[PDB]
mmCIF file of C-alpha atoms and ligand atoms in Angstrom:
data_model
loop_
_atom_site.group_PDB
_atom_site.id
_atom_site.type_symbol
_atom_site.label_atom_id
_atom_site.label_comp_id
_atom_site.label_asym_id
_atom_site.label_seq_id
_atom_site.Cartn_x
_atom_site.Cartn_y
_atom_site.Cartn_z
ATOM 1 C CA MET A 1 15.892 6.302 0.490
ATOM 2 C CA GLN A 2 15.474 3.462 2.733
ATOM 3 C CA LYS A 3 18.105 0.021 1.331
ATOM 4 C CA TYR A 4 17.568 -3.627 2.474
ATOM 5 C CA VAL A 5 19.796 -5.784 1.979
ATOM 6 C CA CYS A 6 19.377 -9.970 2.174
ATOM 7 C CA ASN A 7 19.959 -12.068 4.894
ATOM 8 C CA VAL A 8 21.001 -15.110 2.105
ATOM 9 C CA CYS A 9 22.407 -13.485 -0.349
ATOM 10 C CA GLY A 10 23.915 -10.166 0.292
ATOM 11 C CA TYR A 11 21.699 -8.705 -2.802
ATOM 12 C CA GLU A 12 20.979 -4.954 -1.825
ATOM 13 C CA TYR A 13 17.241 -3.303 -2.347
ATOM 14 C CA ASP A 14 18.434 -0.044 -3.561
ATOM 15 C CA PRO A 15 14.968 1.832 -4.144
ATOM 16 C CA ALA A 16 16.520 4.307 -6.750
ATOM 17 C CA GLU A 17 17.354 0.772 -8.582
ATOM 18 C CA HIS A 18 14.054 -0.257 -8.990
ATOM 19 C CA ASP A 19 12.228 3.535 -10.058
ATOM 20 C CA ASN A 20 11.696 4.281 -6.615
ATOM 21 C CA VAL A 21 9.114 2.046 -5.245
ATOM 22 C CA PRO A 22 10.178 1.540 -1.397
ATOM 23 C CA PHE A 23 10.779 -2.082 -0.255
ATOM 24 C CA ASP A 24 7.704 -1.676 1.821
ATOM 25 C CA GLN A 25 5.616 -0.832 -0.981
ATOM 26 C CA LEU A 26 7.244 -4.367 -3.007
ATOM 27 C CA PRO A 27 4.526 -6.713 -3.456
ATOM 28 C CA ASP A 28 4.232 -9.516 -0.981
ATOM 29 C CA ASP A 29 5.340 -12.298 -3.576
ATOM 30 C CA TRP A 30 8.346 -10.730 -4.941
ATOM 31 C CA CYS A 31 11.516 -12.037 -4.041
ATOM 32 C CA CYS A 32 15.136 -11.689 -4.243
ATOM 33 C CA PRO A 33 16.224 -12.016 -7.129
ATOM 34 C CA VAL A 34 19.957 -13.467 -6.802
ATOM 35 C CA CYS A 35 18.486 -16.035 -4.513
ATOM 36 C CA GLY A 36 14.606 -16.014 -4.437
ATOM 37 C CA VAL A 37 13.899 -15.593 -0.973
ATOM 38 C CA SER A 38 11.302 -13.678 0.483
ATOM 39 C CA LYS A 39 10.774 -9.451 1.534
ATOM 40 C CA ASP A 40 11.153 -11.789 5.032
ATOM 41 C CA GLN A 41 14.563 -12.528 4.618
ATOM 42 C CA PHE A 42 15.927 -8.820 4.160
ATOM 43 C CA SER A 43 17.228 -6.382 6.647
ATOM 44 C CA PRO A 44 17.090 -2.509 6.190
ATOM 45 C CA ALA A 45 21.051 -0.948 6.221
HETATM 46 C C1 LIG B 1 11.051 -15.722 -6.412
HETATM 47 C C2 LIG B 1 11.313 -16.479 -6.080
HETATM 48 C C3 LIG B 1 10.478 -17.662 -6.174
HETATM 49 C C4 LIG B 1 9.104 -18.032 -6.535
HETATM 50 C C5 LIG B 1 8.234 -15.955 -6.242
HETATM 51 C C6 LIG B 1 8.966 -15.289 -6.708
HETATM 52 O O1 LIG B 1 7.011 -16.745 -7.373
HETATM 53 C C7 LIG B 1 6.563 -15.176 -7.455
HETATM 54 C C8 LIG B 1 4.927 -15.236 -7.242
HETATM 55 O O2 LIG B 1 4.446 -16.201 -7.292
HETATM 56 C C9 LIG B 1 3.365 -16.234 -6.864
HETATM 57 C C10 LIG B 1 2.528 -17.184 -5.681
HETATM 58 O O3 LIG B 1 3.345 -18.287 -5.427
HETATM 59 C C11 LIG B 1 2.641 -19.321 -6.846
HETATM 60 C C12 LIG B 1 2.948 -20.570 -6.860
HETATM 61 O O4 LIG B 1 4.061 -20.470 -5.306
HETATM 62 C C13 LIG B 1 4.675 -21.809 -4.758
HETATM 63 C C14 LIG B 1 6.040 -21.830 -6.312
HETATM 64 O O5 LIG B 1 6.495 -20.430 -6.271
HETATM 65 C C15 LIG B 1 7.532 -21.161 -7.596
HETATM 66 C C16 LIG B 1 8.229 -20.198 -7.064
HETATM 67 O O6 LIG B 1 8.294 -18.750 -7.071
HETATM 68 FE FE1 FE B 2 18.990 -13.064 -1.766
HETATM 69 NA NA1 NA B 3 15.357 4.493 7.536
HETATM 70 NA NA1 NA B 4 23.975 -0.554 -5.685
HETATM 71 NA NA1 NA B 5 18.339 -13.572 -11.095
HETATM 72 NA NA1 NA B 6 6.574 -18.423 -1.449
HETATM 73 NA NA1 NA B 7 20.277 -2.805 9.591
#
């Protein structure tokens, strides 16, 4: 399962912690729960 990390605050998106929803399937209006940036500010781990 592909993890992503927020460029700005280091928050880690692990799909297993979000009912197995892959990062790429998140809505375009999702944002980092810590700092509020869009999905554009994430990088794959
Ligand atoms: C995460 C951080 C800040 C947000 C978020 C999410 O908004 C999610 C819902 O967005 C709906 C589309 O945008 C509505 C208005 O956007 C401009 C102001 O948004 C406030 C911050 O929203
Ligand atoms: Fe963040
Ligand atoms: Na991968
Ligand atoms: Na974790
Ligand atoms: Na938060
Ligand atoms: Na926005
Ligand atoms: Na990477």
